[PDB]
Design a protein around this ligand. Structure first.
Ligand SMILES: [Mg+2]
Ligand SMILES: [Mg+2]
Ligand SMILES: [Mg+2]
Ligand SMILES: [Mg+2]
Ligand SMILES: [Mg+2]
Ligand SMILES: [Mg+2]
Ligand SMILES: [Mg+2]
Ligand SMILES: [Mg+2]
Ligand SMILES: [Mg+2]
Ligand SMILES: [Mg+2]
Ligand SMILES: [Mg+2]
Ligand SMILES: [Mg+2]
Ligand SMILES: [Mg+2]
Ligand SMILES: [Mg+2]
Ligand SMILES: [Mg+2]
Ligand SMILES: [Mg+2]
Ligand SMILES: [Mg+2]
Ligand SMILES: [Mg+2]
Ligand SMILES: [Mg+2]
Ligand SMILES: [Mg+2]
Ligand SMILES: [Mg+2]
Ligand SMILES: [Mg+2]
Ligand SMILES: [Mg+2]
Ligand SMILES: [Mg+2]
Ligand SMILES: [Mg+2]
Ligand SMILES: [Mg+2]
Ligand SMILES: [Mg+2]
Ligand SMILES: [Mg+2]
Ligand SMILES: [Mg+2]
Ligand SMILES: [Mg+2]
Ligand SMILES: [Mg+2]
Ligand SMILES: [Mg+2]
Ligand SMILES: [Mg+2]
Ligand SMILES: [Mg+2]
Ligand SMILES: [Mg+2]
Ligand SMILES: [Mg+2]
Ligand SMILES: [Mg+2]
Ligand SMILES: [Mg+2]
Ligand SMILES: [Mg+2]
Ligand SMILES: [Mg+2]
Ligand SMILES: [Mg+2]
Ligand SMILES: [Mg+2]
Ligand SMILES: [Mg+2]
Ligand SMILES: [Mg+2]
Ligand SMILES: [Mg+2]
Lengths: 77, 149, 271, 100
RNA sequence: GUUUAUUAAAAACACAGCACUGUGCAAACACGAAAGUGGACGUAUACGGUGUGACGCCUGCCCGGUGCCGGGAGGUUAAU
């Protein structure tokens, strides 16, 4: 499913308002990508499906710090 | 990004400088190869005392060891006596594997990824100058010779 | 030969048979045969994706060798056979070592002729080679687009690619469409022209000739009602709208090429 | 059986291979009965006009007796070979000597 | 040959053949939020769409309008 591994950004719903305010149901998908992250701890690459904003969190924190939080919830990578 | 640099970067960097770089260059190139590290408070402290004084020079003498690795084979020539066609036009193109194996079997113990080829895959029979990437600055000059059997 | 059928019954009248007197009269080599169950134009979801296909004669798949992996091993052509699954005919090649494989039969080929394949080999019809080894301005077929793959381009009866030019790693090919496509030089190409060139001159003759070939009737949009097709309705043969598919997209002059990643390989589009 | 007169021209950089190329084309014909009547390597001679965008081709005149099987087999080896820039093959009217 | 099971069997539909057109293969196209399937274990003498409708003799003039195709300077032009 279109879910970021890191943040948990799922696809939310909403309206697609026209100039005459015709509310047609749509949905906002998150900016997901299957990226490979080098983990310096175990000397390897780890493939994670993450949102573009997730990558910024992985750059803010440590990939190890994020993989610590990922394992706490009970997920795979 | 800040990014503290461990290795000597080609253009912008020069060992332990906190020069601004684009995140892609950090996470795709500088980090995974082990060339630089992100600089966020505690890393700067690891680089300040421990790495810069000791491990920078240990990383430097490894470049001298890499320069020594070129000096393992003093001959700097390899005579490939592979099978050939009717006067020139070789049977198969000499890839990096054959050169790497031929050099490793009796010369420098270098991996295949460092072995570059300036003049393509070498199909013409004759003398060919080949250069390896033992170090970023210092390049080798091995005189490969493809002979028709 | 291309033999016209005599008009003893209407439906026979117009029939033109491509009577090849060589094609083996008997059962094929079983080890390379396998089942090929018909889909009838439906998919995973069980829905007609591609229309106008369904029925026809039951037909087994012959495992044809497009890759030509046997390097430096001569091979005698044992007998030419009729492939029901393909336009071109096939040749039961018997390799010197022991193996037998089916290949597409080139034009100049008979039972007893020898074929070699691999890197060196000879420049002769049927012999597979890398395009780097093949001369410039030479007729080829069973051409790969990617090195080590099977064989994509020019497999249909009478079809052939011509090698126009080459600059090192790339080779410029002129395909039967007219398209000048650039491919990799390491790719292989079986020399010469694909046989059964008379295939094109057959004319079926009757409706049922299409039906036992696994084709169904194509109903014209204009005949249908407006609910079914964009062409529709009108009390007595009306039209008055621009030609379109069943799903609204304009046929009859409309560029549907939109790959964009392969566009670099195309030197010049067909004309 | 039939007398011939092959005159082929070779690319400048592959003029080193011509001593070799002569040894192969001699070996093909001399093995099959008919002898080579004259050997005359003209050498790197200037061209009147540029063939294949270059000057100075390496000419080689054979002049040889052979059967039709071998001479046509030799004719095919010129076309499937990038070294040889053009060639022609004349008819009989007996063997010859000298002239350039 | 098919068709309105249950008021229409026909001149309607189909049809072999004909043409224009799209499609270079991870094909166009179709089903499908997607994965993935058919197309096709096919590869332009193939495949999809549109029209016409065996065979014989043919198929004329118009590109102003509506579409499509190509050009790519100039004008106008969204987010930023
Ligand atoms: Mg959310
Ligand atoms: Mg939610
Ligand atoms: Mg909107
Ligand atoms: Mg509402
Ligand atoms: Mg993956
Ligand atoms: Mg940026
Ligand atoms: Mg039988
Ligand atoms: Mg299937
Ligand atoms: Mg199923
Ligand atoms: Mg169809
Ligand atoms: Mg035709
Ligand atoms: Mg036809
Ligand atoms: Mg039709
Ligand atoms: Mg109706
Ligand atoms: Mg509707
Ligand atoms: Mg429908
Ligand atoms: Mg409609
Ligand atoms: Mg009506
Ligand atoms: Mg009317
Ligand atoms: Mg009208
Ligand atoms: Mg419209
Ligand atoms: Mg429409
Ligand atoms: Mg046109
Ligand atoms: Mg019925
Ligand atoms: Mg009925
Ligand atoms: Mg009724
Ligand atoms: Mg009723
Ligand atoms: Mg009735
Ligand atoms: Mg006709
Ligand atoms: Mg047609
Ligand atoms: Mg869709
Ligand atoms: Mg299939
Ligand atoms: Mg009609
Ligand atoms: Mg009529
Ligand atoms: Mg009519
Ligand atoms: Mg006529
Ligand atoms: Mg008209
Ligand atoms: Mg007029
Ligand atoms: Mg106009
Ligand atoms: Mg336009
Ligand atoms: Mg221009
Ligand atoms: Mg402009
Ligand atoms: Mg402008
Ligand atoms: Mg403007
Ligand atoms: Mg403006």
């Amino acid at each position: 499913s279109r879910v970021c591994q890191v943040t948990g950004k799922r696809p939310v719903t909403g309206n697609n308002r026209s100039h005459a305010l015709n509310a047609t149901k749509r949905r906002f998908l998150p900016n997901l990508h299957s990226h490979r992250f080098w983990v310096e701890s175990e000397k390897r690459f780890v493939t994670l499906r993450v949102s573009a904003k997730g990558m910024r969190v992985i750059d803010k924190k440590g990939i190890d710090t994020v993989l610590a939080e990922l394992r706490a919830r009970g997920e795979k990578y | 990004m800040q990014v503290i640099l461990l290795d000597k970067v080609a253009n912008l960097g020069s060992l332990g400088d906190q020069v601004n770089v684009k995140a892609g260059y950090a996470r795709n190139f500088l980090v995974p190869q082990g060339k630089a590290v992100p600089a966020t408070k505690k890393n700067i402290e690891f680089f300040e005392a421990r790495r810069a004084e000791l491990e920078a020079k240990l990383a430097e003498v490894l470049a001298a060891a890499n320069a020594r690795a070129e000096k393992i084979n003093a001959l700097e020539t390899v005579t490939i006596a592979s099978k050939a066609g009717d006067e020139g036009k070789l049977f198969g193109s000499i890839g990096t594997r054959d050169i790497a194996d031929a050099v490793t079997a009796a010369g420098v113990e270098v991996a295949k990824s460092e072995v570059r080829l300036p003049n393509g895959v070498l199909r013409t029979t004759g003398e060919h100058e080949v250069s390896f990437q033992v170090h970023s600055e210092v390049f080798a000059k091995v005189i490969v010779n493809v002979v028709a059997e | 030969a291309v033999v016209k059928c005599k008009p003893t019954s209407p439906g026979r009248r117009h029939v033109v048979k491509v009577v090849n007197p060589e094609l083996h009269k008997g059962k094929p080599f079983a080890p390379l045969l396998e089942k090929n169950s018909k889909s009838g134009g439906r998919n995973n979801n069980g829905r007609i994706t591609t229309r106008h296909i369904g029925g026809g004669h039951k037909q087994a798949y012959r495992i044809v060798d497009f890759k030509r992996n046997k390097d430096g091993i001569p091979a005698v052509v044992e007998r030419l056979e009729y492939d029901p699954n393909r336009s071109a005919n096939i040749a039961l090649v018997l390799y010197k070592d022991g193996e037998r494989r089916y290949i597409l039969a080139p034009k100049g080929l008979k039972a007893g002729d020898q074929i070699q394949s691999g890197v060196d080999a000879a420049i002769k019809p049927g012999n597979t080679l890398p395009m780097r080894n093949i001369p410039v301005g030479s007729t080829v077929h069973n051409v790969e687009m990617k090195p080590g793959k099977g064989g994509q381009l020019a497999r249909s009866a009478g079809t052939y690619v011509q090698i126009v030019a080459r600059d090192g790693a790339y080779v410029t090919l002129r395909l039967r469409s007219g398209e000048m496509r650039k491919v990799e030089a390491d790719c292989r190409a079986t020399l010469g022209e694909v046989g059964n060139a008379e295939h094109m001159l057959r004319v079926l003759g009757k409706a049922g000739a299409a039906r036992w070939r696994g084709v169904r009737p194509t109903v014209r949009g204009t005949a249908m009602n407006p609910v079914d097709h964009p062409h529709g309705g009108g009390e007595g043969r009306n039209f008055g709208k621009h030609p379109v598919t069943p799903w609204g997209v304009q046929t009859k002059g409309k560029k549907t090429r939109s790959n964009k990643r392969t566009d670099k390989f195309i030197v010049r589009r067909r004309s | 059986m039939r007398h011939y007169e092959i005159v082929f021209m070779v690319h400048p950089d592959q003029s080193e291979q011509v001593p070799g190329m002569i040894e192969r084309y001699t070996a093909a014909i001399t093995g099959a009965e008919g002898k080579i009547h004259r050997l005359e390597d003209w050498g790197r001679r200037q061209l009147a006009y540029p063939i294949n965008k270059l000057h100075k081709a390496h000419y080689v005149l054979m002049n040889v007796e052979a059967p039709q099987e071998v001479i046509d087999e030799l004719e095919t080896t010129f076309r499937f070979n990038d070294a040889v820039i053009r060639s022609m093959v004349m008819r009989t009217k007996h063997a010859v000597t000298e002239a350039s």
